[PDB]
Amino acid sequence: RDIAKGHLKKVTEQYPDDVEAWIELAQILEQTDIQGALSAYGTATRILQEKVQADVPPEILNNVGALHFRLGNLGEAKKYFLASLDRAKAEAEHDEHYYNAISVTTSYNLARLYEAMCEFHEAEKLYKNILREHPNYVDCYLRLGAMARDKGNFYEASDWFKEALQINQDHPDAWSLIGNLHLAKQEWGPGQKKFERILKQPSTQSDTYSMLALGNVWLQTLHQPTRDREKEKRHQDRALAIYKQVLRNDAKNLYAANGIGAVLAHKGYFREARDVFAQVREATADISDVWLNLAHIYVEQKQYISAVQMYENCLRKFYKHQNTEVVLYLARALFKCGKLQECKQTLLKARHVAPSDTVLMFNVALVLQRLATSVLKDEKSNLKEVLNAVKELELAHRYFSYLSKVGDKMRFDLALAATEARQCSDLLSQAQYHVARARKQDEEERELRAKQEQEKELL
């Protein structure tokens, strides 16, 4: 490609009646900066009208619209695709160049755009129009399942993906999608190894995708209290061997280092996890995983100032606003004034979208107790706050009574709520003691204002 780029740089300056030179310019720049190809197509579109009045072939407008499809010019790319379809239809005599395939690919990109233009009805209609004329096509039949998969992972998605594999078992995308199906329900933890080892035959090798899927499904087995049984250490060693193997054959793969940092963090090296995650962050930090793995290291070293922002940034994406896992990772060792009262605000924001989780209903009570003990033990503070603390403690006690009746828990029984009840009892006693102090401060302020008013009367 370097010699071709140099040759195009030579043909660009001079003007020996160049007609197709810009086409070759753009044909290489599609992998590189996407604006160079757009500039080349922009000039190539107008250079095809001086020699004769010849309409632009649909293949160039189709490729420029494809370039714009990845960009924010979705409507402009839509116009490009529609005009390409109109032009390709006019090719009644270009049976050798197969205008039909040009229309097929243009409509494929157009349906991909409509699926991306918040219009899945038109995307379904267009992909089905491709199906009705060419059932031997895979990508349309695979995107239709993705569309039905948004509503749920048990609808026609899980059926179309397997029918697509049954028609082409040597298609890595379809088989990987098959493995992707089992990821919604992780009950197939150990058993997904078999279905991920179907296309691990040497003919398909090497395939980094499936090997990293194995590494991920093997990492999921971690975070268990059975590590002392020499079981999770072997799992760490196996996943580390997988990551080393995919590192030797591919040193630039970021996920291998991601998993290596994950395991090293699991090994107790957080001081040494930042260095390994640094290369992954510097390569491309716009992946949802790194913002959290790094925020875990920051929140581990008593740096919530550098961890709350990382959790906020991961939520800046247009997919949700109040996720449960992010807020769960948000409150780890928060004890400061701006990290308890506000922590309640974010906890309520999280519980608003799905209150059925027990961990939220337990953490809200724990933070309520923390504030109450933080205002009813060593304070001697404002009075209205002593009035509000008893209400907060009563709500916490009601939630203590309610949480005990729930059957399932966070893979750990909550029978240890008794100490919380005793804590709240002595908090109630201390509150009934400190309300008298509140009244004493009330009479103090009253006599202070009186002894100031007398001086003002003197003046």
Binding site: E282, I305, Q309, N313
Partner: protein, 149 residues
């Protein structure tokens, strides 16, 4: 540690009011994460820079990893580790004014560190959260490295 600030930036405009001198130019850069302004002045002659280039600016109070708080003097004969080994442009200055949007009642929310590297100025304007390590009359460094990306 001594890392008073750490963030990636990108060049977006050079000498908007016309290049006055011949070896120094204004770099009206912007951040990518903390969203902070930057008016750094680098020696364009020895360290050329064009628009769109990104660099890892790291204001550090010292050049040593252990952070021994050097007195401040040119001592090239030194075998101790130095943080400058992984930076292509380092400077040494002394912040002289920390302006902010303070009021009579509520604390400030956005500060503005004014540091002079012996004549080369730099305004690190932004929020008042990450500028806690800047105090008037204190020595600081720059430690910037251009990113190849």
């Amino acid at each position: 540690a001594g890392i008073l600030f750490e963030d990636i930036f990108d060049v977006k405009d050079i000498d908007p009011e016309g290049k006055k001198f011949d070896r120094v130019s204004r770099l009206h850069c912007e951040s990518e994460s903390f969203k902070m302004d930057l008016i750094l002045d680098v020696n364009i002659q020895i360290y050329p820079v064009d628009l769109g280039d990104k660099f890892r600016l790291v204001i550090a109070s010292t050049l040593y990893e252990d952070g021994t708080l050097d007195d401040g003097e040119y001592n090239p004969t030194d075998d101790r580790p130095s943080r400058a080994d992984q930076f292509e442009y380092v400077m040494y200055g002394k912040v002289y004014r920390i302006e902010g949007d303070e009021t009579s009642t509520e604390a400030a929310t956005r500060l503005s560190a004014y540091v002079s590297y012996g004549g080369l100025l730099m305004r690190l304007q932004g929020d008042a959260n990450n500028l806690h390590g800047f105090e008037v009359d204190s020595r600081v460094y720059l430690l910037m490295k251009k990113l190849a990306f």
